[PDB]
Amino acid sequence: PQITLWKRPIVTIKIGGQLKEALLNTGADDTVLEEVNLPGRWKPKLIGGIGGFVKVRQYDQVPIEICGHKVIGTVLVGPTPTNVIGRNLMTQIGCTLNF
Amino acid sequence: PQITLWKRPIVTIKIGGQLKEALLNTGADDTVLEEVNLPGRWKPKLIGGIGGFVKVRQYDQVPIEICGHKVIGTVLVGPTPTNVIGRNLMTQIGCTLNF
Ligand SMILES: CC(C)CN(C[C@@H](O)[C@H](Cc1ccccc1)NC(=O)O[C@H]1CO[C@H]2OCC[C@H]21)S(=O)(=O)c1ccc(N)cc1
Protein backbone atom coordinates (compact mmCIF):
# COMPACT_ATOMS: atom_id res chain seq x y z
CA PRO A 1 0.00 0.00 0.00
CA GLN A 2 1.00 3.66 -0.34
CA ILE A 3 0.83 5.60 2.93
CA THR A 4 0.92 9.38 3.06
CA LEU A 5 1.87 11.51 6.01
CA TRP A 6 -1.01 13.92 6.57
CA LYS A 7 -1.30 11.74 9.66
CA ARG A 8 0.84 9.29 11.65
CA PRO A 9 1.62 6.23 9.49
CA ILE A 10 0.06 3.71 11.86
CA VAL A 11 -0.47 0.08 11.03
CA THR A 12 -1.47 -3.18 12.67
CA ILE A 13 1.02 -5.63 14.11
CA LYS A 14 0.69 -8.99 15.81
CA ILE A 15 3.01 -9.74 18.73
CA GLY A 16 2.78 -12.63 21.20
CA GLY A 17 -0.47 -13.74 19.57
CA GLN A 18 -1.95 -10.29 20.16
CA LEU A 19 -3.32 -7.65 17.80
CA LYS A 20 -1.89 -4.13 18.12
CA GLU A 21 -0.94 -0.96 16.25
CA ALA A 22 2.33 0.94 15.95
CA LEU A 23 3.80 4.01 14.30
CA LEU A 24 5.94 3.11 11.29
CA ASN A 25 9.03 4.98 12.42
CA THR A 26 11.99 5.81 10.16
CA GLY A 27 13.75 7.78 12.91
CA ALA A 28 14.99 4.86 14.97
CA ASP A 29 17.31 1.95 14.25
CA ASP A 30 15.29 -0.53 16.33
CA THR A 31 11.66 -1.29 17.17
CA VAL A 32 10.14 -0.37 20.56
CA LEU A 33 6.86 -1.51 22.11
CA GLU A 34 4.51 -0.85 25.02
CA GLU A 35 5.13 -3.34 27.83
CA VAL A 36 4.19 -6.74 26.42
CA ASN A 37 4.67 -10.49 27.06
CA LEU A 38 7.47 -12.24 25.15
CA PRO A 39 9.35 -15.45 24.32
CA GLY A 40 12.64 -15.99 26.15
CA ARG A 41 15.76 -14.10 27.24
CA TRP A 42 16.33 -10.36 26.88
CA LYS A 43 19.34 -8.06 27.23
CA PRO A 44 19.37 -4.72 29.04
CA LYS A 45 19.68 -1.78 26.68
CA LEU A 46 19.79 2.01 26.93
CA ILE A 47 18.28 3.88 24.00
CA GLY A 48 18.54 7.66 23.68
CA GLY A 49 16.00 10.02 22.19
CA ILE A 50 14.39 13.42 22.62
CA GLY A 51 14.00 13.77 26.35
CA GLY A 52 17.12 11.79 27.13
CA PHE A 53 17.74 8.12 27.87
CA VAL A 54 15.24 5.31 28.52
CA LYS A 55 15.79 1.74 29.71
CA VAL A 56 14.52 -1.06 27.50
CA ARG A 57 14.42 -4.84 27.35
CA GLN A 58 16.07 -6.14 24.18
CA TYR A 59 14.35 -9.27 22.92
CA ASP A 60 16.42 -10.73 20.08
CA GLN A 61 15.18 -12.51 16.93
CA VAL A 62 11.46 -12.36 17.77
CA PRO A 63 8.59 -13.36 15.48
CA ILE A 64 6.27 -10.45 14.66
CA GLU A 65 3.57 -9.80 12.04
CA ILE A 66 3.54 -6.29 10.64
CA CYS A 67 0.62 -5.44 8.36
CA GLY A 68 0.26 -9.21 8.10
CA HIS A 69 3.67 -10.20 6.76
CA LYS A 70 6.00 -12.25 8.92
CA VAL A 71 9.20 -10.77 10.18
CA ILE A 72 11.75 -11.92 12.71
CA GLY A 73 13.90 -9.16 14.19
CA THR A 74 14.88 -7.24 17.28
CA VAL A 75 12.12 -5.88 19.49
CA LEU A 76 12.90 -3.43 22.26
CA VAL A 77 10.47 -3.42 25.17
CA GLY A 78 10.10 -0.48 27.53
CA PRO A 79 8.10 2.58 28.57
CA THR A 80 7.47 4.10 25.13
CA PRO A 81 4.59 6.60 24.91
CA THR A 82 3.71 4.83 21.68
CA ASN A 83 4.72 1.72 19.73
CA VAL A 84 7.37 2.28 17.12
CA ILE A 85 8.35 0.05 14.20
CA GLY A 86 12.02 0.70 13.44
CA ARG A 87 14.06 0.47 10.24
CA ASN A 88 15.18 -2.99 11.34
CA LEU A 89 11.79 -4.53 10.60
CA MET A 90 10.64 -2.10 7.93
CA THR A 91 13.33 -3.27 5.54
CA GLN A 92 12.12 -6.87 5.64
CA ILE A 93 8.70 -6.10 4.27
CA GLY A 94 10.30 -3.96 1.58
CA CYS A 95 9.32 -0.64 3.06
CA THR A 96 10.89 2.28 1.25
CA LEU A 97 10.46 6.06 1.34
CA ASN A 98 8.94 7.38 -1.88
CA PHE A 99 9.19 10.95 -3.10
CA PRO B 1 13.74 8.83 -5.33
CA GLN B 2 12.80 5.49 -3.91
CA ILE B 3 14.90 5.09 -0.83
CA THR B 4 15.53 1.94 1.10
CA LEU B 5 15.93 1.82 4.85
CA TRP B 6 19.13 -0.13 5.34
CA LYS B 7 20.78 3.08 6.44
CA ARG B 8 19.52 6.27 8.05
CA PRO B 9 17.54 8.05 5.29
CA ILE B 10 19.67 11.19 5.60
CA VAL B 11 19.13 13.86 2.97
CA THR B 12 20.59 17.32 2.28
CA ILE B 13 18.69 20.39 3.47
CA LYS B 14 19.21 24.14 3.15
CA ILE B 15 18.28 26.83 5.69
CA GLY B 16 19.48 30.43 5.95
CA GLY B 17 21.80 29.54 3.10
CA GLN B 18 23.26 26.84 5.33
CA LEU B 19 23.76 23.38 3.91
CA LYS B 20 23.17 20.66 6.45
CA GLU B 21 21.72 17.15 6.46
CA ALA B 22 18.65 15.73 8.16
CA LEU B 23 16.86 12.45 8.77
CA LEU B 24 13.68 11.89 6.78
CA ASN B 25 11.72 10.90 9.88
CA THR B 26 8.20 9.44 9.65
CA GLY B 27 8.00 8.98 13.41
CA ALA B 28 8.27 12.71 14.03
CA ASP B 29 5.36 14.99 13.18
CA ASP B 30 7.54 18.04 13.68
CA THR B 31 10.80 19.14 12.13
CA VAL B 32 13.60 19.52 14.67
CA LEU B 33 17.09 20.86 14.02
CA GLU B 34 19.99 21.26 16.43
CA GLU B 35 21.21 24.75 15.57
CA VAL B 36 20.37 27.21 12.86
CA ASN B 37 21.31 30.80 12.18
CA LEU B 38 17.87 32.22 11.73
CA PRO B 39 18.06 35.93 12.26
CA GLY B 40 15.81 36.80 15.24
CA ARG B 41 12.65 36.04 17.23
CA TRP B 42 11.59 32.50 18.11
CA LYS B 43 8.56 31.15 19.96
CA PRO B 44 8.57 28.84 23.01
CA LYS B 45 7.35 25.33 22.31
CA LEU B 46 7.06 21.95 24.01
CA ILE B 47 7.35 18.61 22.28
CA GLY B 48 7.43 15.22 23.95
CA GLY B 49 9.78 12.57 22.67
CA ILE B 50 10.43 9.03 23.82
CA GLY B 51 12.34 10.08 26.94
CA GLY B 52 10.25 13.01 28.14
CA PHE B 53 9.39 16.63 27.30
CA VAL B 54 11.86 19.25 26.02
CA LYS B 55 11.91 23.01 25.43
CA VAL B 56 12.40 23.89 21.79
CA ARG B 57 12.38 27.11 19.73
CA GLN B 58 9.50 27.33 17.21
CA TYR B 59 10.12 29.15 13.93
CA ASP B 60 7.07 29.84 11.74
CA GLN B 61 7.00 29.65 7.97
CA VAL B 62 10.68 28.98 7.29
CA PRO B 63 11.73 28.58 3.68
CA ILE B 64 13.74 25.37 3.55
CA GLU B 65 15.26 23.36 0.71
CA ILE B 66 15.34 19.56 0.73
CA CYS B 67 17.13 17.88 -2.20
CA GLY B 68 16.80 21.08 -4.21
CA HIS B 69 13.09 21.17 -3.50
CA LYS B 70 11.96 24.42 -1.90
CA VAL B 71 9.29 24.10 0.75
CA ILE B 72 7.93 26.10 3.65
CA GLY B 73 6.77 25.33 7.18
CA THR B 74 7.52 25.30 10.87
CA VAL B 75 11.06 24.47 11.94
CA LEU B 76 11.72 23.83 15.63
CA VAL B 77 15.17 24.06 17.23
CA GLY B 78 15.80 21.52 19.96
CA PRO B 79 17.80 18.89 21.85
CA THR B 80 17.74 16.22 19.17
CA PRO B 81 20.40 13.50 18.78
CA THR B 82 20.09 13.93 15.02
CA ASN B 83 18.61 16.55 12.71
CA VAL B 84 15.07 15.38 11.96
CA ILE B 85 12.68 16.57 9.27
CA GLY B 86 9.19 15.41 10.24
CA ARG B 87 5.89 14.99 8.44
CA ASN B 88 4.84 18.66 8.33
CA LEU B 89 7.53 19.11 5.72
CA MET B 90 7.59 15.64 4.22
CA THR B 91 4.01 16.04 2.98
CA GLN B 92 5.02 19.10 1.02
CA ILE B 93 7.46 17.07 -1.06
CA GLY B 94 4.62 14.60 -1.57
CA CYS B 95 6.68 11.92 0.14
CA THR B 96 5.03 8.59 0.95
CA LEU B 97 5.71 5.33 2.76
CA ASN B 98 5.61 2.35 0.41
CA PHE B 99 5.54 -1.45 0.53
C1 LIG C 1 14.45 12.00 17.44
C2 LIG C 1 14.58 10.49 17.35
C3 LIG C 1 15.96 10.06 16.83
C4 LIG C 1 14.25 9.84 18.68
N5 LIG C 1 13.49 8.62 18.38
C6 LIG C 1 12.85 8.44 17.08
C7 LIG C 1 11.63 9.35 16.90
O8 LIG C 1 10.88 8.83 15.79
C9 LIG C 1 10.65 9.44 18.08
C10 LIG C 1 9.66 8.26 18.02
C11 LIG C 1 8.38 8.65 18.72
C12 LIG C 1 7.17 8.66 18.04
C13 LIG C 1 6.00 9.01 18.70
C14 LIG C 1 6.03 9.37 20.04
C15 LIG C 1 7.23 9.37 20.73
C16 LIG C 1 8.41 9.01 20.06
N17 LIG C 1 9.84 10.65 17.99
C18 LIG C 1 10.16 11.84 18.49
O19 LIG C 1 10.33 12.07 19.68
O20 LIG C 1 10.29 12.89 17.51
C21 LIG C 1 9.84 14.19 17.90
C22 LIG C 1 9.74 15.06 16.64
O23 LIG C 1 8.46 15.71 16.67
C24 LIG C 1 7.63 15.19 17.69
O25 LIG C 1 6.57 14.47 17.08
C26 LIG C 1 6.46 13.14 17.60
C27 LIG C 1 7.74 12.87 18.38
C28 LIG C 1 8.45 14.20 18.50
S29 LIG C 1 13.39 7.58 19.49
O30 LIG C 1 12.01 7.35 19.80
O31 LIG C 1 14.04 8.12 20.63
C32 LIG C 1 14.05 6.16 19.18
C33 LIG C 1 15.20 5.81 19.90
C34 LIG C 1 15.76 4.55 19.75
C35 LIG C 1 15.14 3.60 18.93
N36 LIG C 1 15.70 2.38 18.78
C37 LIG C 1 13.95 3.92 18.25
C38 LIG C 1 13.38 5.18 18.41
Residues B50, A53: C-beta atoms closer than 8 Å: no
Which are the residues after which chain A is interrupted (C to N > 2.5 Å)? none
Scanning every residue of chain B, which has its alpha carbon at the shortest distance from the alpha carbon of A90? B5
Task: Give the span between the Cα atoms of A82 and B84, in whole angstroms.
Answer: 18
- The span from the CA of A98 to the CA of B96, in Å, is 5
C-alpha B23 – ligand 1 centre gap (Å): 12
Q: Spelled out in words, what is the top-level CATH class assigned to the domain B1-99?
A: mainly beta
Contact B48, B59 (CB under 8 A): no
Which residue ranges have their beta carbon within 6 Å of ligand 1? A 23, 25, 27-30, 32, 47, 49-50, 76, 81-82, 84, 86; B 25, 27-30, 32, 47, 49-50, 80-82, 84, 86
Dist CA A99 CA A62 (whole Å): 31
Q: Hey, where are the domains in chain B?
A: 1-99
| Residue A7, number of CB atoms within 10 A of its CB | 10
How far apart are alpha carbons A26 and A35 in whole angstroms?
21
Distance (angstroms) between ligand 1 centre and the Cα of B25 equals 9
Biggest CA–CA distance in chain A, Å, is 40
* Chain A residues 36-55 with a CB less than 8 Å from chain B: 47-54
Burial class from Cβ neighbours inside 10 Å (0-12, 13-18, 19+) for residue A13 reads buried
What DSSP string runs through chain B? -EEESSS--EEEEEETTEEEEEEE-SS-SSEEES-----S--EEEEEE-SS-EEEEEEEEEEEEEETTEEEEEEEEE---SS-EE-HHHHTTTT-EEE-
For chain A, positions 69-98, list CB contacts with chain B under 8 A: 80-81, 84, 87, 90-91, 93-98
Q: Of A5, A9, A48, which has the smallest distance from its Cβ to B81's Cβ? A: A48
Query: d(Cα A92, Cα A66) in Å, to the nearest integer?
Result: 10
- Residues B86, A9: Cα–Cα separation, whole Å: 12
Using CB atoms within 10 Å of the CB of residue A40, give its burial: 0 to 12 exposed, 13 to 18 middle, 19+ buried.
Answer: exposed
Q: SS3 of A90, please?
A: helix
Read off φ and ψ for residue A62, nearest 5 degrees. Answer: -105, 145
* Resolution in Å, one decimal place: 2.9
Beta carbons of A51 and B49 less than 8 angstroms apart: yes
- CB-based contact, B22 to chain A, within 8 Å: no
